[PDB]
Design a protein around this ligand. Structure first.
Ligand SMILES: Nc1ncnc2c1ncn2[C@@H]1O[C@@H](COP(=O)(O)OP(=O)(O)O)[C@@H](O)[C@H]1OP(=O)(O)O
Ligand SMILES: Nc1ncnc2c1ncn2[C@@H]1O[C@@H](COP(=O)(O)OP(=O)(O)O)[C@@H](O)[C@H]1OP(=O)(O)O
Ligand SMILES: O=C(NO)[C@H](O)[C@H](O)COP(=O)(O)O
Ligand SMILES: [Cl-]
Ligand SMILES: [Cl-]
Lengths: 471, 469
């Protein structure tokens, strides 16, 4: 009927896949659409009659409608549903065809699928897609990994549909590396997001609890902060939510939202990889635990009634302290990214990916929630030295930490004395102080392990493995 | 050769000592190790003991009286898997196989399911107390079929540490399948946490107060006489006495600050992430080990990154006491988190874990033996459904009285530039746990704004989405 007339195909007609299909079509392509439940495909086709969408009813029809080598983007429920969909497509495909997974997929699944399909001559591109539903329609940030030669055939469409960085128009997409490299980078993006949200939450909490600032006052502070080096979309969202009235009562909606952070699911993934890899990732991990502890609302309400803490009234200079919190925020953000890019470095070694670090920062500049102006300084760092082990060692970040650390320390002293919980700010300064310590007290830990366990140790003065007679 | 009442596989530090423990209780004990020369050493070094030297697995199995009791003390993972695989076909119905290693609990759960109808009794057990614990009396944490447990309970009780308080064996039934190995993992998590807190205390005493090893040795010694009375504090004051065996000065000073790990602390944090359990202190202590392995980077970074170069000008005695208070307070935070994890794991895997009993069997033969373990048991006696140790009267009191000193230690350390990831994590956890309201409301607003994720409200039931545009 429409045999081999479609340039590209999308499976999954929920909002994400639907929007991606419309995005690709709008760039001047005929797009085959498919969904397990046909009514949803029918609904998309009917409402977008003037677009070059090919309505297909079966997988056989879907596959038949596509030019070879076929380019097929899966936008289906992660896990079992993606494997079931892959399994359904496989008999119908030809050698050289290209499957693309745009779901929020756990990278080992992508690595497994990629290896299995390669045995059948089928290319597999696991792609991180950021920006949510609006990003899918208008321009996502994208992180593809898979066979390079297959990806080069997909790249022009991705570069067309991708978000364009507002500073230079560069598309927010690039090849990440083989197999699961793309979904790995997307995972780290999502960990980083968790960290950035907790850091802002701590800033808001300090302003509210210690300085006694109103929602309107706090809105104005974030606005002003966003005009400087902190310039980021999450801070923009923050000052936007602080404006809003409760839709079901007096005051502000933000004050009526129950303090139980959402979901579980996929947010732990970055932390779990860091643990597997021997990578220090304390900031993002504190952010995950901060969400978990918020879900323990009932216990916290009970605990608030029995446990004691300070009842301090702040008497210092508000303006001075606001600026100090601004410094602590940016410093702590720098700690989290340094840790996150160090994790990417280790993962790259472990999986042999040659991850393009500076480019990663470039493609995060638009079409994702963590977009922020300082991503440029991360790119400059890796432009200067692509083998940079850690961002903290780059001149630009060295200067910031030198000048900003004093403020962080003060902020930590103030918040801790006042009793306001700051797990990520405290973790930030602890990482800074650990990373720059030539000697850490892990010599004592090693002595203890050798004492009870005979685990042996290394010495400071000569090569070799040693065991002490403690008895 | 069916002379032997009990068999041990794995003749390294733990298995050798366990074998000798069992033999001392008036048994003849079969010994096996994959490298035969190791078995030969302990056989030769202990000819007065009733040990049976065996060189092959068929001989090992043959030397045991039926129903056979075989305990494995082998390297976790593939080593243990291959040993059990080689061993199973040699075994008879009614035989008992015990995995005493630090096996990742899911492996044990799988093993238990696979062996459920083989006629071979399987027990996965945690063993604590280190090399001397294995010899003189370990804490044991067995899981599996209750019927299987009952078969080994008598001999487990004989070899187990006995609590000094009441003489009770430091072994009890943990629960089905992998429960015992799960409890041991959490035990090690807590252990990592306390070891990092101790290292931070030592770092503060040495770097801020400028104290010598003898001075710090004496401090920990005095601390161990009070409520800080524990195995880890005891062995710290022992370690700090020792002189270098290959040169001048203290051995502790000649040990490279690169902490090793064999997976259990990592596995604890992984499980906490999986279960939705906030476990910041133990997890921070794992990352603290990780960052110590980045020695070359830290050496480079120390020459480039700047920080405070301040000189403590205050009263040393007062600050030492504040560190003591803070160390005890933070030790409590570590256990409270470990037990919160155990509660969530018990519910997830339907283990009905005996929290109070767990604290009891940790009273001896145990790396994490602490003075407040009885108060942990008292807390669970009072409320079997106790959600968190911090809600118990005994712990309410300590935190009330000690929280001020913690804030002072954190502030002093942070201004000085001395890294305290677990001390800061401890006060953060305390301040978060007691906050009726956290700033997660702002996070929920951001998520609804960007991704329509929805929220709950403070003032009414149901789920809501705001029209942000
Ligand atoms: N088991 C399965 N096999 C094949 N496709 C499946 C599937 N489970 C879910 N999907 C597809 O994947 C879904 C989208 O993934 P999702 O679960 O992330 O969506 P949403 O975010 O809207 O809940 C739907 O497109 C679904 O097809 P239907 O519209 O027919 O439900
Ligand atoms: N890959 C493997 N397969 C079978 N057994 C193994 C093994 N790796 C280790 N083991 C056994 O399990 C080990 C348990 O000790 P260990 O490895 O934790 O400490 P140590 O380094 O002191 O031997 C040893 O008993 C070992 O037997 P060998 O003496 O022959 O090494
Ligand atoms: O379980 C033990 N002792 O309690 C073992 O010594 C274990 O190896 C200690 O943990 P680690 O080696 O990961 O530090
Ligand atoms: Cl590939
Ligand atoms: Cl995003």
């Amino acid at each position: 009927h429409h045999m081999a007339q479609a340039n590209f195909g999308v499976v999954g007609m929920a909002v994400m896949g639907k929007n991606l299909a419309l995005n690709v079509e709008s760039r001047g392509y005929t797009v085959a659409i498919y969904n397990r439940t046909t009514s949803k495909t029918e609904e998309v086709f009917k409402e977008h009659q003037d677009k070059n969408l090919v309505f297909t009813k079966t997988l056989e029809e879907f596959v038949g409608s596509l030019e070879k080598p076929r380019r097929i983007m899966l936008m289906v429920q992660a896990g079992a549903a993606t494997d079931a969909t892959i399994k359904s497509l496989l008999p119908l495909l030809d050698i050289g065809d290209i499957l693309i997974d745009g779901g929020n997929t756990h990278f080992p699944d992508t690595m497994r699928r990629n290896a299995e399909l390669a045995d059948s001559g089928i290319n597999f591109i696991g792609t991180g897609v950021s920006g949510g539903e609006k990003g899918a329609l208008l321009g996502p940030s994208m992180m593809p990994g898979g066979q390079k030669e297959a990806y080069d055939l997909v790249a022009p469409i991705f570069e067309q549909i991708a978000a364009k960085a507002p500073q230079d128009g560069k598309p927010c997409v690039a090849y990440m590396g083989a197999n699961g490299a793309g979904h790995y980078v997307k995972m780290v993006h999502n960990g980083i997001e968790y960290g950035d949200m907790q850091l802002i939450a701590e800033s808001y909490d300090l302003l509210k609890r210690i300085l006694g600032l109103s929602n309107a006052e706090i809105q104005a502070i974030f606005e002003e902060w966003n005009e400087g080096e902190l310039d980021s979309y999450l801070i923009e969202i923050t000052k936007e939510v602080l404006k809003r009235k409760d839709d079901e009562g007096e005051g502000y909606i933000v004050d009526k939202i129950l303090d139980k952070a959402g979901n579980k699911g996929t947010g732990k993934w970055t932390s779990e990889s860091a643990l597997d890899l021997g990578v220090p990732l304390p900031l993002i991990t504190e952010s995950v635990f901060a969400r978990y502890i918020s879900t323990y609302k009932d216990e916290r309400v009970k605990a608030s009634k029995v446990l004691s803490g300070p009842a301090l009234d702040f008497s210092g200079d508000k303006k001075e302290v606001i600026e100090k919190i601004r410094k602590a925020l940016y410093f702590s953000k720098i700690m989290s990214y340094a840790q996150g890019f160090a994790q990417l470095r280790k993962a790259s070694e472990e999986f042999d990916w040659d991850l393009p670090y500076g480019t990663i920062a470039q493609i995060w500049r638009a079409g994702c929630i963590i977009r922020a102006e300082f991503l440029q300084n991360i790119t400059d760092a890796f432009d200067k030295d692509s083998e940079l082990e850690n961002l903290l060692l780059d001149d630009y970040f060295v200067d910031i930490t030198k000048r900003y650390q004093e403020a962080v320390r003060d902020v930590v002293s103030l918040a801790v004395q006042a009793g306001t919980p700051i797990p990520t700010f405290t973790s930030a300064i602890s990482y800074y102080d650990s990373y720059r310590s030539e000697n850490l007290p892990a010599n004592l830990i090693q002595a203890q392990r050798d004492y009870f366990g005979a685990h042996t140790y290394e010495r400071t003065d000569k090569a070799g493995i040693f065991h002490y007679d403690w008895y």
